[PDB]
């Protein structure tokens, strides 16, 4: 199977998923002075209020904070997207210091983390459908930087310790993501692809331009997590980032000035 090991990581992933190599692969560093400002962008509408939380997994990558979606309870709309996208699940990329994490780049500069916060089309039905449609998706992506505690993880940070390993999950009821959002929805928006194998081109990424502020405690807790197995040798969860891809011509559009 593929990961982000020597032996399995991103620069392997195309002898498996061939669309690594693609046109519109995710993620891209985003260089600010050649994103243009779009006037016909909207604000993002990020209708949060009744998200229902149910349950967290080690899925042996990452974790998934997954979300019911078998109702129009947490959606994206407005921003550059047409019609509505139901909140699936969160989970971050992070590293295996403060200095790296990030899947996208901002001017070549990496994050220590990256929340991303995935949406599925609601006029494709279900999010298998979804992925095989090009605009299938819309993920809300949100740095993280090293600083003062974002109190709205805490709960997430807490829970690790009981999902260590791969295969592990807990439930994870009434865990409000609008705590996970920085003040200002100011964003980039191109047209790209998952991060992750199958790696299918079918995501409106929405970048936040504002990253959040989470503690050096908080993010040495993402680093305790295992990709591995209960019983199996201790391979700490860090460094579960795909590089920048090439941009390829897509343009990057900014929603502010
Ligand atoms: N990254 S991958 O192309 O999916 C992959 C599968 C795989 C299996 C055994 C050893 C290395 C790799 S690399
Ligand atoms: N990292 S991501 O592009 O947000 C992502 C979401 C997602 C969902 C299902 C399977 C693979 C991936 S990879
Ligand atoms: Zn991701």
Same mark, same amino acid.
């Given at each position: 199977?593929?990961?982000?090991?020597?032996?399995?990581?991103?620069?392997?992933?195309?002898?498996?998923?061939?669309?690594?190599?693609?046109?519109?692969?995710?993620?891209?560093?985003?260089?600010?002075?050649?994103?243009?400002?779009? *006037?016909?962008?909207?604000?993002?509408?990020?209708?949060?209020?009744?998200?229902?939380?149910?349950?967290?997994?080690?899925?042996?990558?990452?974790?998934?904070?997954?979300?019911?979606?078998?109702?129009?309870?947490?959606?994206?709309?407005?921003? *550059?997207?047409?019609?509505?996208?139901?909140?699936?699940?969160?989970?971050?990329?992070?590293?295996?210091?403060?200095?790296?994490?990030?899947?996208?780049?901002?001017?070549?500069?990496?994050?220590?983390?990256?929340?991303?916060?995935?949406?599925?089309?609601?006029?494709?039905?279900? %999010?298998?459908?979804?992925?095989?449609?090009?605009?299938?998706?819309?993920?809300?992506?949100?740095?993280?930087?090293?600083?003062?505690?974002?109190?709205?993880?805490?709960?997430?940070?807490?829970?690790?310790?009981?999902?260590?390993?791969?295969?592990?999950?807990?439930?994870?009821?009434? %865990?409000?993501?609008?705590?996970?959002?920085?003040?200002?929805?100011?964003?980039?928006?191109?047209?790209?692809?998952?991060?992750?194998? *199958?790696?299918?081109?079918?995501?409106?990424?929405?970048?936040?331009?504002?990253?959040?502020?989470?503690?050096?405690?908080?993010?040495?807790?993402?680093?305790?997590?295992?990709?591995?197995?209960?019983?199996?040798?201790?391979?700490?969860?860090?460094?579960?980032?795909?590089?920048?891809? *090439?941009?390829?011509?897509?343009?990057?559009?900014?929603?502010?000035?």
């Amino acid at each position: 199977h593929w990961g982000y090991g020597k032996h399995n990581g991103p620069e392997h992933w195309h002898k498996d998923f061939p669309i690594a190599k693609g046109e519109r692969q995710s993620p891209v560093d985003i260089d600010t002075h050649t994103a243009k400002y779009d *006037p016909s962008l909207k604000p993002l509408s990020v209708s949060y209020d009744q998200a229902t939380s149910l349950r967290i997994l080690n899925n042996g990558h990452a974790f998934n904070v997954e979300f019911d979606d078998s109702q129009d309870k947490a959606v994206l709309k407005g921003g *550059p997207l047409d019609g509505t996208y139901r909140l699936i699940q969160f989970h971050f990329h992070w590293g295996s210091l403060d200095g790296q994490g990030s899947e996208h780049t901002v001017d070549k500069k990496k994050y220590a983390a990256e929340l991303h916060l995935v949406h599925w089309n609601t006029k494709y039905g279900d %999010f298998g459908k979804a992925v095989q449609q090009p605009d299938g998706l819309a993920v809300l992506g949100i740095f993280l930087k090293v600083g003062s505690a974002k109190p709205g993880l805490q709960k997430v940070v807490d829970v690790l310790d009981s999902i260590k390993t791969k295969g592990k999950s807990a439930d994870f009821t009434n %865990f409000d993501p609008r705590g996970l959002l920085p003040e200002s929805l100011d964003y980039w928006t191109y047209p790209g692809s998952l991060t992750t194998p *199958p790696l299918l081109e079918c995501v409106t990424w929405i970048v936040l331009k504002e990253p959040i502020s989470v503690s050096s405690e908080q993010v040495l807790k993402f680093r305790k997590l295992n990709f591995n197995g209960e019983g199996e040798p201790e391979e700490l969860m860090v460094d579960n980032w795909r590089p920048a891809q *090439p941009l390829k011509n897509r343009q990057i559009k900014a929603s502010f000035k």
